Amino acid sequence: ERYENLFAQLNDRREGAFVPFVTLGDPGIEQSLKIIDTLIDAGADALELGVPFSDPLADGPTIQNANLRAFAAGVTPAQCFEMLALIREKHPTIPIGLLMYANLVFNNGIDAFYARCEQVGVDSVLVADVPVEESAPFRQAALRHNIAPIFICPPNADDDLLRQVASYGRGYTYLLSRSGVTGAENRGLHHLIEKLKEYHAAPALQGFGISSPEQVSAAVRAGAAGAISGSAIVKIIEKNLASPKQMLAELRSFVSAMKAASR
Amino acid sequence: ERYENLFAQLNDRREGAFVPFVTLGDPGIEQSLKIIDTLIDAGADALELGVPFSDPLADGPTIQNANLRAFAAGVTPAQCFEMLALIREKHPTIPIGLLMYANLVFNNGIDAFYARCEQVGVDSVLVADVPVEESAPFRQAALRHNIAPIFICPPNADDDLLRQVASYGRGYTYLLSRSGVTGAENRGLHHLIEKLKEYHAAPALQGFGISSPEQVSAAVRAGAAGAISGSAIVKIIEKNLASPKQMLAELRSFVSAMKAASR
Amino acid sequence: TTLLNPYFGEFGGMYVPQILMPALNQLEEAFVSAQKDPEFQAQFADLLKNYAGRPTALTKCQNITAGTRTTLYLKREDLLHGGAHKTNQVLGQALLAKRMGKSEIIAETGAGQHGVASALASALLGLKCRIYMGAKDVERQSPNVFRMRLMGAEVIPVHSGSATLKDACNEALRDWSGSYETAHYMLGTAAGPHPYPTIVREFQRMIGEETKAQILDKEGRLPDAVIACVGGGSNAIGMFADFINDTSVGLIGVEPGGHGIETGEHGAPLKHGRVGIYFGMKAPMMQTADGQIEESYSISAGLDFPSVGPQHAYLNSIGRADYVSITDDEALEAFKTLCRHEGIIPALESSHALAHALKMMREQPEKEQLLVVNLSGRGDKDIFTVHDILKARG
Amino acid sequence: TTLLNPYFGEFGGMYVPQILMPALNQLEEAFVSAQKDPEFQAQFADLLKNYAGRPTALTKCQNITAGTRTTLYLKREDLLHGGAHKTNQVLGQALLAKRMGKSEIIAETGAGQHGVASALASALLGLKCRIYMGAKDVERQSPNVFRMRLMGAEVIPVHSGSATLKDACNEALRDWSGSYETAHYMLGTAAGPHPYPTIVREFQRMIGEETKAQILDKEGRLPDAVIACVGGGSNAIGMFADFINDTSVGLIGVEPGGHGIETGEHGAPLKHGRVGIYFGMKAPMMQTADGQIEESYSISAGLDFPSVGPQHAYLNSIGRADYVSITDDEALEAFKTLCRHEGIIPALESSHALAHALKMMREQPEKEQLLVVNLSGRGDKDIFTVHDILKARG
Ligand SMILES: C=C(NCc1c(COP(=O)(O)O)cnc(C)c1O)C(=O)O
Ligand SMILES: C=C(NCc1c(COP(=O)(O)O)cnc(C)c1O)C(=O)O
Ligand SMILES: O=P(O)(O)OC[C@@H](O)CO
Ligand SMILES: O=P(O)(O)OC[C@@H](O)CO
Ligand SMILES: [Cs+]
Ligand SMILES: [Cs+]
Ligand SMILES: [Cs+]
Ligand SMILES: [Cs+]
Ligand SMILES: [Cs+]
């Protein structure tokens, strides 16, 4: 119960969670692994990881390019699962969540996918292009393999959706900051946050557009159990492709700043 | 009665007539005048002259270019009539026939046109784009000014046309060698020639495609009172634009050869 | 003589070299016969409907007349197979060609719409088609050159003179004079020697007949005025024909004003020319004082001709039809207005008609008036031309 | 839940990010309501007829079937305003957009025919239109880019991926996910998340309804088979829809075979793909063993897509409809054959359908069969592309 233990501990220390996001294999397998260890050493409470997909329709340019880079390095889903195994072997308690696109999950069989997630130590799975309306087979497979199915609570969510997300979700609730696709440049909820807690929904993590410490503190202050940052992280990766050393340094610096803001 | 006197004399000498054609003002007024004197000195029995027209629809490239050249030299219809006056002033007995396009005749008034033809000494007028069907006002104006109206006898002429041409025409009958437009490269009638004589049509001159002595003799042998050659003449003009001297020499040589063939 | 009157008042006739009279006479006879032949009419109708797509729609323009008392309809000849009204009479002339046992077709073209129409009809009816087109037009109306070739037609560039419509016409006639036994000259407009102005009107009159029926059904009355651009005069007479005896209906022909009438660079002989004889007819001509036929001009290749059909000269003479001109710029503003506010891309030729209509509305916005503009063709062929001009302007 | 079944068997669904479900739900509700609204149907009909020019003709091809027992008719969607069947459902979706109070339009386009249709409808109905088009297609279907701009639409080149249809689709969806409150995504084919496959079929079914009425009146019976090219599946389902319950009528969809199926360079996921989830639907996808969506290929931009509408996947599954493929070369030979022997220049997309029909006739020339090919569009947009290829060959 990695998520349950994290939020319990965080609650005691009265702090929110900072969850960085990166695409596995960007810019390469080895460097991606170091990048993730740095994110954890820098202060990451949990991880949100993506698997390169040919058509990431919920992602803006930053993460699109992250996917392209991973593809240039020949990164495949199989290699992503080998990486997840290694990451879990080095960090036994950090909660690991995957952000997937439906075809990759459906490809070799939905159940087989979640069976593999369980085998490598994954804690949750969010399928970006599978709304609650199409979630049955995915949420069911997840639960059968002790994987928490993650659901998104959009800013335009009505009561029926709040309730569905509350009962179907496990681990954490992905609280969308805004409409649109992923992107750090686009910056985006107290009421929604309250309703979720009313319906006993898994703890809420805010995502999309979160790229500054100020935004982290704001989310926590508003009631959110934490925040997720992807594009902002990925941007540091692409700007430092030439200097891997300065890349990690810049990343550690940024993550620490984002995490401190959650205290 | 220039045409009547020519055919009478020619008949006695038992020869056919050679009638060269050139566009007035090509390549220029002065040179055109010399070209015509040479044609006459070389043996021309009568003249067939054209007046530069913007759209000579019955003419092929050779004469089209002749018209262009005359236009480059600024040759106008007024200047053409001044030339005709000079030509008639030097040659009192040679029959002069004009080959015109309807608009030039109709422009300042049909009657005024034929009045001017009579004033400068012109003997006949052939309007290329005026069939017998539209000829009334033209033939009438011509006769009123002692100008012979010339009609074409096409190779596809039926009996009604033979008869019309026979009674309306004066001077000579233009016997078409072939369909198409003027052109020396395109070489084209005994029955038609006979029918015309039966209906007492003005003497017949064959035209279009006549560019060799052989063709001249053939026309006369077939019964025609003579032949007309335009493009063949004009071609010598354009090939010798650089050497006016060799131009006239070449022309005299050619005309003599064509005329001899009519003996 | 002839079976039909070759004249419209003083205008018209058969001013062609004697050699072509038999061909003209044969064509007239074949036309008269075909007009009384049920089978011919049925075959013509079948092609127009099932092949060309007639009847064409009559579109009401609600957007461009907003805030005025002008109701404007567009006869959509732009939707006809091929893209212009030209296709109508070409199907009829092709049938006449077969009827006369001719296996080849000669045609002239400026906007290339008549060329395309001639090529497609020939491909469909088994005729060998050759098209004359001025070199300038080969360039400014290129999309159509490609279409013609693709359909098996021989396109022949004419570099003589102004390298435009007029010159293409000259070559077509020269060619026919030497091949009339096997080739039929499919003249593309209501001009030239009789019987062409008559044949072309009759094979285009469906435009006005449909326009009348459609306007009556949609408005319960006739138009205050039908407006059409005038090149040689086919789409305009095609639109006018059936309204001629309806005295209340204004007939407005719009000649190209080019860069403006005062510049001499236009194609408006009807209102700024002088009667002359050329291209087998006695009609208004843009001509010099000397009697030389001048070169015309217009941003639209289809209207770029120094003369006009004889019936238009006649209708103007007796005052039945009024003719005006529209400059390049006025046509362009109309072109853009239709594109952006009605979602229809009109041919630049048609745009001249639309331009006048828009003027009639704008000048007297409170005048109640029902107008119909013959949208003779679509402007796909004019896209590159219009783009380059609008680019050099921003 | 939803008001209508989002699936056709196992294919279909609404696989989009949660943020877009309200927009999809709103669209479905608006569509259902509009379908029971007499005023909406009347307005739709009015636009289709008086603006678009429906009904389109059904042309019999006597020349190309000579010496065989094959009778072939062509549904002339190429005569529709805009030049392709695309215009039909765009008029309907535009009305739905207004009905929903949306003032902007997002559309993707490959052949540019949907882009042009979206632009003209928006110009006519007062909507701000922006179109996504792959850069490769901006080039090979350029005539349409010009048309779109001229009508006031913003054309946005997409350089990502294969720079073709698929990529234009991706961008359109990304854009909509962030602007659905003010913009309506006018998807151009019978694919994507429900309710689009249903809406697009319904707003295109007039093709088949008219085809049935026209074939009955001309032949007294139904077709042995209706044939249409299949990109996303709109013109094909539009043609098929009304014949589905007529069990004797063969439904043949023609997927692009590109350079040949064995080369992997094609757009035939239906018969050579594997079911997957992408572009909001569970449907056959050309995809790697890993589950990555592959890039498709086809000489015709309109068919260059790695997936297909879910209803086609379903109809094929139960065996109601048969799907085949036609290579680039086969489509080109059909394109030229129609141009030269029927005088119609077909879109390269439509040419794939015609190619199969010609194969069906040639392979069994003594087999008596009545066929109808949906000529989805005219090929004006393909002239330069075809010319360059035929030039490099002579
Ligand atoms: C001369 C040619 N076009 C004329 C044309 C015209 C002018 O010709 P009319 O004969 O006057 O109708 C009007 N509208 C369209 C769309 C046109 O294509 C041609 O296509 O060869
Ligand atoms: C993708 C586009 N075109 C598709 C198209 C197609 C294929 O799409 P369908 O949706 O399968 O009908 C067939 N025919 C014509 C003439 C076309 O333009 C487009 O215009 O954007
Ligand atoms: O990139 P962001 O900051 O918009 O976050 C969204 C995802 O990338 C992480 O879930
Ligand atoms: O040029 P030709 O030889 O065809 O003769 C025709 C005219 O030029 C003279 O009438
Ligand atoms: Cs109005
Ligand atoms: Cs004109
Ligand atoms: Cs129609
Ligand atoms: Cs047949
Ligand atoms: Cs496809």
C-alpha to C-alpha distance for D274 and A133, rounded to whole angstroms: 23
Cβ-contact C125, C157 below 8 angstroms: no
Cβ-contact C175, C108 below 8 angstroms: no
**Closest to B28 in 3D by CA, of B238, B211, B232, B207:** B238
- For D147, the closest of C51, C341, C383 (CB atoms) is C383
With the most atoms of ligand 2 within 8 angstroms of its CB, the residue from D158, D166, D196, D303 to mutate is D303
> Under an 8 A CB cutoff, do D291 and A78 touch?
no
Reduced 3-state DSSP string for chain C? CCCCCCEECCEEEEECCHHHHHHHHHHHHHHHHHHCCHHHHHHHHHHHHHHHCCCCCEEEECCCCCCCCEEEEEECHHHCCCCECHHHHHHHHHHHHHHCCCCEEEEEECCCHHHHHHHHHHHHHCCEEEEEEEHHHHHHCHHHHHHHHHCCCEEEEECCCCCCHHHHHHHHHHHHHCCCCCEEECCCCCCCCCCHHHHHHHCCCHHHHHHHHHHHHHHCCCCCEEEEECCCCHHHHHHHHHHCCCCCCEEEEEEEEECEHHHCECCCHHHHCEEEEECEEEEEECECCCCCECCCCCCCHHHCCCECCHHHHHHHHCCCEEEEEEEHHHHHHHHHHHHHHHCCCECHHHHHHHHHHHHHHHHCCCCCEEEEEECCEECHHHHHHHHHHHHCCC
C-alpha to C-alpha distance for D3 and D24, rounded to whole angstroms: 11
Nearest chain C residue to D117 by CA distance is C343
- Site from B24, B54, B192 to mutate, C interface, most C CB atoms within 10 angstroms: B54
Ligand nearest to the CA of D55: 7
Residue A4 main-chain phi, psi, to 5 deg: -60, -45
**Closest to A127 in 3D by CA, of A251, A119, B72, A136:** A136
With the most atoms of ligand 1 within 8 angstroms of its CB, the residue from C349, C350, C351 to mutate is C349
Judged by a CB distance cut-off of 8 A, whether residue A154 touches chain D is yes
User: Partners for D (CB, 8 Å, 3+ pairs)?
Assistant: A, C
With the most atoms of ligand 2 within 8 angstroms of its CB, the residue from D129, D145, D189 to mutate is D189
Q: Is A20 in the pocket of ligand 3 (CB under 6 A)?
A: no
What is the C-alpha R_g of chain D?
19
DSSP chain A: -HHHHHHHHHHHTT--EEEEEEETTSS-HHHHHHHHHHHHHTT-SSEEEE---S--TTB-HHHHHHHHHHHHTT--HHHHHHHHHHHHHH-SSS-EEEEE-HHHHHTT-HHHHHHHHHHHT--EEEETT--GGG-HHHHHHHHHTT-EEE-EE-TT--HHHHHHHHHH--S-EEEESSSS-B-SS----HHHHHHHHHTT---EEEESS--SHHHHHHHHHTT-SEEEE-HHHHHHHHHTSS-HHHHHHHHHHHHHHHHHTT-
β-sheet with C183-185: strand ranges across:
C154-158, C128-134, C104-109, C183-185
- For C16, the closest of B64, B131, B156 (CB atoms) is B131
**β D280-285/D274-278 pair status:** antiparallel
Could you tell me the residue ranges of all domains in chain D?
Answer: 8-52+86-204, 53-85+205-390
Chains C and D make contact, 3+ CB pairs within 8 Å: yes
A1 is annotated as an active-site residue: no
Cβ-contact C197, C311 below 8 angstroms: yes
Method: X-ray
C-alpha to C-alpha distance for C197 and C32, rounded to whole angstroms: 14
CATH number of the domain at B143, please: 3.20.20.70
H or E, element range at D354: helix D348-363
C-alpha to C-alpha distance for A51 and A125, rounded to whole angstroms: 11
What is the D303 CA–ligand 9 centroid distance (Å)? 5
**β D7-8/D11-15 pair status:** antiparallel
User: Partners for A (CB, 8 Å, 3+ pairs)?
Assistant: D
**β A152-153/D183-185 pair status:** unpaired
Neighbour-count burial of A16, counting CB atoms closer than 10 A to its CB (0-12 exposed, 13-18 middle, 19+ buried): buried
Cβ-contact D3, D29 below 8 angstroms: yes
D53-85+205-390 classified as CATH 3.30.360.10: no
CATH architecture of D8-52+86-204: 3-Layer(aba) Sandwich (3.40)
Q: Is C377 in the pocket of ligand 1 (CB under 6 A)?
A: yes
At residue B158, the 3 state secondary structure works out as coil
Domain span including residue B53: 1-263
Residue burial A140-167, b: 16+ Cβ < 10 Å; e: rest: ebbeebebbbbbbbbebbeeebbbbbbe
Residues of C (10-29) whose Cβ lies below 8 Å from B:
13-22
Cβ-contact D152, C340 below 8 angstroms: yes
C-alpha to C-alpha distance for C258 and D19, rounded to whole angstroms: 56
Cβ-contact C66, C365 below 8 angstroms: no
Residue pairs between chains C and D whose CB atoms are closer than 8 Å: 112
Considering only CB atoms, which chain C residues are within 8 Å of B60?
174
Judged by a CB distance cut-off of 8 A, whether residue B130 touches chain C is yes
State both tokens at C147. Answer: 């279409």
C-alpha to C-alpha distance for D125 and D94, rounded to whole angstroms: 7
DSSP state at residue B55 = -
**β C280-285/C11-15 pair status:** antiparallel
Instruction: List, in order, residues 6 or more apart from D226 with CB less than 8 Å away.
Output: D208, D211, D239, D240, D243, D249, D250, D251, D252, D371, D372, D373, D374
Distance from CA of A79 to the nearest CA of D (A): 11
Neighbour-count burial of C73, counting CB atoms closer than 10 A to its CB (0-12 exposed, 13-18 middle, 19+ buried): buried
One-letter amino acid for residue C314 of the chain: Y
C-alpha to C-alpha distance for D55 and A260, rounded to whole angstroms: 68
Distances (CA, A) of D200 to D184, D207, D279: 14, 12, 15
C-alpha to C-alpha distance for A113 and C170, rounded to whole angstroms: 77
Ligand nearest to the CA of C155: 1
Measured from the Cα of C168, ligand 1's closest atom is 21
Resolution (A): 1.9
One-letter amino acid for residue A162 of the chain: L
**Closest to A44 in 3D by CA, of A14, A85, A64, A16:** A16
Cβ atoms within 10 Å of C391's Cβ, excluding its own: 8
C-alpha to C-alpha distance for D106 and D168, rounded to whole angstroms: 11
**Closest to D118 in 3D by CA, of D105, D136, D103:** D105
Measured from the Cα of C204, ligand 1's closest atom is 12
Considering only CB atoms, which chain A residues are within 8 Å of D178?
178-181
Ligand nearest to the CA of B186: 4
Q: Count CA atoms closer than 13 A to B243's CA, side-chain side.
A: 9
- Site from D380, D387, D389, D390 to mutate, C interface, most C CB atoms within 10 angstroms: D380
Nearest chain C residue to D390 by CA distance is C150
Same fold, D8-52+86-204 and D53-85+205-390: yes
C-alpha to C-alpha distance for D74 and D3, rounded to whole angstroms: 36
Domain count, chain A: 1
C-alpha to C-alpha distance for D279 and D12, rounded to whole angstroms: 10
C-alpha to C-alpha distance for C16 and C196, rounded to whole angstroms: 13
Chains B and C make contact, 3+ CB pairs within 8 Å: yes
Residue pairs between chains B and C whose CB atoms are closer than 8 Å: 98
C-alpha to C-alpha distance for A191 and A195, rounded to whole angstroms: 6
User: Partners for C (CB, 8 Å, 3+ pairs)?
Assistant: B, D
Nearest chain B residue to C169 by CA distance is B57
Catalytic one of A15, A26, A45, A48: A48
